[PDB]
Each structure stands twice: as C-alpha cells, then as structure tokens.
Amino acid sequence: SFQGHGIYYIASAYVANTRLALSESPDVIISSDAVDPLNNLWLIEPVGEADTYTVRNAFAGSYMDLAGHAATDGTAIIGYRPTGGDNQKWIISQWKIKSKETGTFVTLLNGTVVGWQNITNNTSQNWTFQKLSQTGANVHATLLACPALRQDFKSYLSDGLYLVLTRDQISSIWQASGLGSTPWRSEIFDCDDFATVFKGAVAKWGNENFKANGFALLCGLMFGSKSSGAHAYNWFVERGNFSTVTFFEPQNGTYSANAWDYKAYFGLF
Amino acid sequence: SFQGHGIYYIASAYVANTRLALSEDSSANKSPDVIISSDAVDPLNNLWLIEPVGEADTYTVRNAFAGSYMDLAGHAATDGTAIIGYRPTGGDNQKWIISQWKIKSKETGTFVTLLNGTVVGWQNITNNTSQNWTFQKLSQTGANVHATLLACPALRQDFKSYLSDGLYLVLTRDQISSIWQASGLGSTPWRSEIFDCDDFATVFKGAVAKWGNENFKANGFALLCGLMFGSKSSGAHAYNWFVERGNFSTVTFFEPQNGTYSANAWDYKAYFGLF
Numbered sequence: 375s376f377q378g379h380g381i382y383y384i385a386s387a388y389v390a391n392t393r394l395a396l397s398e399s400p401d402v403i404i405s406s407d408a409v410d411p412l413n414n415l416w417l418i419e420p421v422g423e424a425d426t427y428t429v430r431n432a433f434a435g436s437y438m439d440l441a442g443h444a445a446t447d448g449t450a451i452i453g454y455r456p457t458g459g460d461n462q463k464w465i466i467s468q469w470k471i472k473s474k475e476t477g478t479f480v481t482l483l484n485g486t487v488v489g490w491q492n493i494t495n496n497t498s499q500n501w502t503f504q505k506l507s508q509t510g511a512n513v514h515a516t517l518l519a520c521p522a523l524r525q526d527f528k529s530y531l532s533d534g535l536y537l538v539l540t541r542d543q544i545s546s547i548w549q550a551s552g553l554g555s556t557p558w559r560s561e562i563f564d565c566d567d568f569a570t571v572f573k574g575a576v577a578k579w580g581n582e583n584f585k586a587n588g589f590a591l592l593c594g595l596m597f598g599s600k601s602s603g604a605h606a607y608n609w610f611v612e613r614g615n616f617s618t619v620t621f622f623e624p625q626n627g628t629y630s631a632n633a634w635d636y637k638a639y640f641g642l643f
Numbered sequence: 644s645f646q647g648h649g650i651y652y653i654a655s656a657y658v659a660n661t662r663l664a665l666s667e668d669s670s671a672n673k674s675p676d677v678i679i680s681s682d683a684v685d686p687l688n689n690l691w692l693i694e695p696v697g698e699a700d701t702y703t704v705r706n707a708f709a710g711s712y713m714d715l716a717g718h719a720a721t722d723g724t725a726i727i728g729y730r731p732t733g734g735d736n737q738k739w740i741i742s743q744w745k746i747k748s749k750e751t752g753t754f755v756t757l758l759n760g761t762v763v764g765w766q767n768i769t770n771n772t773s774q775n776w777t778f779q780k781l782s783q784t785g786a787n788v789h790a791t792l793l794a795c796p797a798l799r800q801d802f803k804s805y806l807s808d809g810l811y812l813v814l815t816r817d818q819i820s821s822i823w824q825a826s827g828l829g830s831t832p833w834r835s836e837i838f839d840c841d842d843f844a845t846v847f848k849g850a851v852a853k854w855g856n857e858n859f860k861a862n863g864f865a866l867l868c869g870l871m872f873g874s875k876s877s878g879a880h881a882y883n884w885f886v887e888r889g890n891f892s893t894v895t896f897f898e899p900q901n902g903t904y905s906a907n908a909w910d911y912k913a914y915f916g917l918f
C-alpha cells in the first residue's frame with residue numbers, strides 16, 4: 375500500500391502484471407512484472423503539502439512530469455530534470471495520482487501513460503503501490519527485535535531511507551565482487567574483511583546504478599559470537615517480510631535465517 | 644628495538660641507510676636472495692614478519708610481501724652461505740635466534756652477515772659489526788591500538804569501538820595516499836545517502852583491506868585502517884583514522900572524500916570506531 379515517503383513499484387490496477395518504468399524526453403512506460411529492471415523503482419518524496427509528493431525514477435534520476443504542464447487529455451507522462459514545477463508534484467490519495475498543477479490523472483491509455491481528466495467508467499487511473507523501502511527507524515526497530523542478538527548488542531546507522539534489495543540483486547553484487555573466488559587468510563583477509571568489503575561492494579553498486587539521491591542500499595554488517603568463536607557477516611531484511619532479519623555469508627554468498635548460531639554484539643547499516 | 648612478535652625493518656648497524664629486503668628475481672634453480680636495500684625507498688619487500696615458534700628467543704622471519712621465509716641455504720654452516728627466501732619447511736634453517744642485536748640460525752649457530760654487499764651466514768665475527776642489525780617495529784597489536792584509541796582526545800563519552808584483528812601493520816602516508824589515489828574516491832561525486840560520508844569511509848576501508856590482500860602473500864597480520872562515526876553540534880560525519888609510524892600513540896584522521904589528513908578530526912568527536 376502507499377505509505378508516503380518511500381520507494382515503490384507503481385502497478386496498474388486496471389490490468390495485471392503491469393507496472394511503471396521509464397524508457398531509456400523519456401516516457402513513463404508500462405513494464406512487465408515478470409522482469410525487475412531497476413528503472414521500475416520510484417522514489418516518492420513529500421513536499422510539505424498534504425498528500426503531495428515528487429515521484430522520481432531512482433535509476434535515471436528523472437522526475438515524473440506532466441509534459442509541458444498541459445491539462446489536455448492524453449498529455450504524455452515523462453521523466454524530466456527537476457524543475458520545482460507543479461507539473462512534477464503529485465497528489466497520491468485513496469489509489470490515484472493527480473497532478474497538482476492540472477488536476478489531471480496519471481492514466482493507462484489503450485498501452486501508454488498519460489494525463490487525463492477524471493474517468494469514472496473504468497479503473498485506468500487506479501494504481502497500487504508496493505513499498506520496497508524502510509526508514510532508518512524501521513530497520514533499527516526490526517534489528518532490535520531480532521532474536522540473534524547478544525545482550526550487549528549495539529548498532530549504528532548511516533542513512534535515513536533504505537532500498538531493500540532482492541536476493542537476485544544481492545547475489546548479482548556478490549558474484550560481481552570476486553569474493554567467492556578470494557581465499558580466506560588469517561587476519562589479512564578473514565571474516566571481517568569479507569563482510570566489510572562486501573558492504574562496500576553494495577554501496578559502490580548503488581552509486582554506479584542509481585542517479586537519484588536521498589536513499590541508501592540496505593547492507594548490514596555484524597560481528598557476533600558463540601561458544602566456538604566469533605565471526606563477521608552481513609545481514610538484510612527482506613521484501614516479503616520487513617520485520618525479519620536474514621543473514622548473509624560474504625565468503626560464499628549463502629543466506630541463513632539463524633546466523634549460523636552467532637549472537638551479534640555489533641551491527642552497522 | 645626488537646620486541647618479539649611483530650613486523651619490522653631489519654637494518655644493518657654496520658653501514659648506514661641499508662636494510663634487508665627480498666629479491667624479486669628467482670628461477671627454477673635459484674631461490675630469491677635476501678638482499679640489501681636503500682632506506683631512500685620503501686618497497687614492500689623490505690617488511691619482515693617475525694613470528695615466535697615456541698622456543699626461547701626463536702622466530703621465523705617471513706617476507707610480508709613475498710610470503711617466503713628467510714632461510715639459510717642448504718642448512719650449511721659454512722661461511723658465506725647464501726641467505727634466501729624459501730617456502731616454509733618447518734626446518735631449523737628457517738628458525739632464527741634474535742638476541743641483544745644479532746640474528747643466529749638455530750640450525751647452524753652462524754649469523755646473518757652483511758658481506759662486502761651480500762647477505763650470508765657466517766661464523767661469529769668479533770673484528771667488525773657486520774653481524775649487528777637494528778629492528779624498527781612497524782606493527783601494533785589489537786590491544787596496543789585499542790589503548791591508543793581510548794587515550795586520544797577525539798572521543799565522545801559514549802564512544803564504543805570494535806576490534807577486528809590481532810596484529811596490525813601501520814602504513815605510511817605514502818602508502819595510504821597511493822591506495823586512496825587508486826580507489827577513485829577523489830573523483831567520485833558526493834551524493835546524499837546514496838554515496839555520502841558513510842560510503843566514502845566504508846569503501847576506503849575496504850580498499851585498504853583489498854590492497855593488503857593483493858600485495859602481501861604472508862598471512863597473520865592486518866592493515867590498520869580505522870572507521871569512525873562522530874559528531875559535533877553542527878552535524879555528524881564518517882571518516883577514517885590511523886596511527887602514525889613516528890609515534891604510535893598519535894591518532895591521525897583521514898578524509899576519504901579528498902585524501903586529506905587532520906590532527907583534530909575537524910572537531911568531530913567519535914561515538915563509533917571499527918578497526
């Protein structure tokens with residue numbers, strides 16, 4: 375559901391398996407949900423006015439814009455440089471997406487994405503929003519409710535809004551990192567290094583792939599311990615259940631639900 | 644001075660400006676020689692990782708760069724026997740008794756000697772100082788750096804830190820800067836959240852770790868590269884930190900956005916450190 379400030383898929387309610395992306399001025403286009411190209415991610419940021427936001431392509435950096443400010447039925451919805459204009463402010467209410475400037479609506483036509491006056495005989499102006507982000511407070515609270523913490527656990531965070539990546543994305547970053555073909559070596563490249571390097575790899579991949587600012591990629595680092603010893607590893611929350619912390623071994627790219635029995639004493643994200 | 648387990652330059656006390664390094668040249672039938680090296684340059688193969696082997700004053704002496712062990716060729720006690728770098732064997736001709744300084748082969752009782760120059764084993768010499776060496780410690784233990792960190796003036800009351808490794812190499816500024824230059828951080832634009840101070844500091848920290856992995860074939864130590872989050876009344880910032888070779892008690896701060904060093908951490912006071 376739409377919940378204000380966040381990163382979302384914007385899906386048509388009118389036809390199945392259809393969501394918004396930006397062409398490669400670029401048009402806002404329909405996109406199949408069988409694929410997950412990064413230009414389907416929309417960073418929705420409040421502007422102060424009730425239920426009013428900018429809607430920004432995270433990948434391309436462009437802003438959803440009603441072309442030429444035109445109120446005319448069938449005016450293109452495009453991606454544009456930021457202008458401060460009212461044709462880049464969108465009233466999202468319950469869901470429809472209404473231009474502040476014209477009062478025309480983002481509409482799926484025929485298909486193409488356009489501005490149109492209110493339509494009441496079909497659902498072509500109705501949209502569903504799947505939240506893909508967590509605030510820093512969201513993740514902090516999840517982290518603290520995690521059952522795999524040592525009693526002295528302390529955590530620190532760096533950013534106020536996070537994209538939650540898919541496993542496909544995390545694993546692609548990990549494959550590209552070269553860590554899986556890096557031999558473990560005592561001190562010089564041991565668990566702390568794998569976990570630190572991998573967190574950095576995720577950050578670099580974000581920088582390479584997203585032209586928008588105002589959000590970070592969630593990639594947690596933990597130090598933890600158990601009776602046999604102590605270990606460094608990574609962690610995440612997942613899209614299907616944001617309240618669950620999942621663990622990741624940067625030496626071999628595997629996930630664990632219970633952190634290999636380690637109880638974290640330090641968390642960074 | 645020699646202080647047991649650690650990483651050191653081993654310099655001749657017989658002639659100035661001269662320390663030990665390992666040759667980069669070898670062949671099927673020739674091991675790399677331990678050689679003399681000018682202290683006007685700082686090639687990584689001048690670094691020696693000296694590790695106790697559980698006998699009084701006895702150590703392996705490993706080239707941090709090449710991974711090779713200082714080895715008395717052929718176990719020979721004969722004067723003028725080559726001192727080489729060899730794969731680890733566990734043999735007594737790779738074990739060295741270091742006493743107050745001289746370096747004596749456990750196998751032969753002969754001493755590492757600067758001859759003419761070349762580096763050879765030789766019986767005890769009393770009419771010159773060619774068997775005398777100085778050791779400059781370039782490493783700190785985890786406990787050493789923690790103490791240093793706790794005694795510095797740049798921490799908040801609530802500061803917590805977390806230690807990663809046991810034995811650290813302390814890098815030079817030239818080395819830190821060369822890693823930083825190679826990272827491309829200096830030409831990466833700052834962008835809020837997506838690539839901001841936290842990312843510069845974390846990514847640089849990882850850059851140092853990869854540089855260590857890629858340039859040192861020995862194991863059993865890490866490179867010191869601290870991460871700090873700190874604040875002051877005007878906002879919060881992430882940055883890196885180190886200790887100085889000239890004074891291991893001095894914490895120096897490093898800005899990974901532009902490669903600059905600061906003695907005062909730009910007035911930030913740390914709440915979090917990782918090293």
Ligand SMILES: *[C@@H](C(=O)O)[C@H](O)C(=O)N[C@@H](CC(C)C)C(=O)NCCCCNC(N)=[NH2+]
Pocket residue numbers: 564565566596597598603604605606785806807808809
């Ligand atoms: C982890 C691995 O490669 O599996 C590697 O053994 C390692 O570094 N282990 C650690 C702790 C990780 C850094 C979490 C360890 O067991 N000890 C060294 C770190 C210092 C411990 N903390 C203090 N204050 N002594």
Ligand SMILES: *[C@@H](C(=O)O)[C@H](O)C(=O)N[C@@H](CC(C)C)C(=O)NCCCCNC(N)=[NH2+]
Pocket residue numbers: 510511512514531532533534839840841871872873879880881
């Ligand atoms: C630092 C910079 O680029 O100079 C950048 O502003 C930044 O990341 N600042 C941080 C703190 C550093 C990581 C030390 C920051 O203040 N981020 C805000 C985090 C949001 C905290 N939220 C909650 N819920 N506690």
Ligand SMILES: OC[C@H]1O[C@@H](O)[C@H](O)[C@@H](O)[C@H]1O
Pocket residue numbers: 399439440441442443454457459461
């Ligand atoms: O060409 C499309 C552009 O048209 C301009 O008139 C407008 O100010 C922009 O926000 C963008 O819509």
Ligand SMILES: OC[C@H]1O[C@@H](O)[C@H](O)[C@@H](O)[C@H]1O
Pocket residue numbers: 674714715716717718729732734736
């Ligand atoms: O050729 C040099 C080698 O000779 C062998 O006899 C010895 O076992 C090795 O330690 C190395 O010294």
Ligand SMILES: [Ca+2]
Pocket residue numbers: 532533534836839840841
């Ligand atoms: Ca940040």
Ligand SMILES: [Ca+2]
Pocket residue numbers: 561562563564565566567807808865
């Ligand atoms: Ca390490």
Ligand SMILES: [Ca+2]
Pocket residue numbers: 561564565566807808809
């Ligand atoms: Ca370690």
Ligand SMILES: [Ca+2]
Pocket residue numbers: 532533590836837838839840841842
């Ligand atoms: Ca960040």
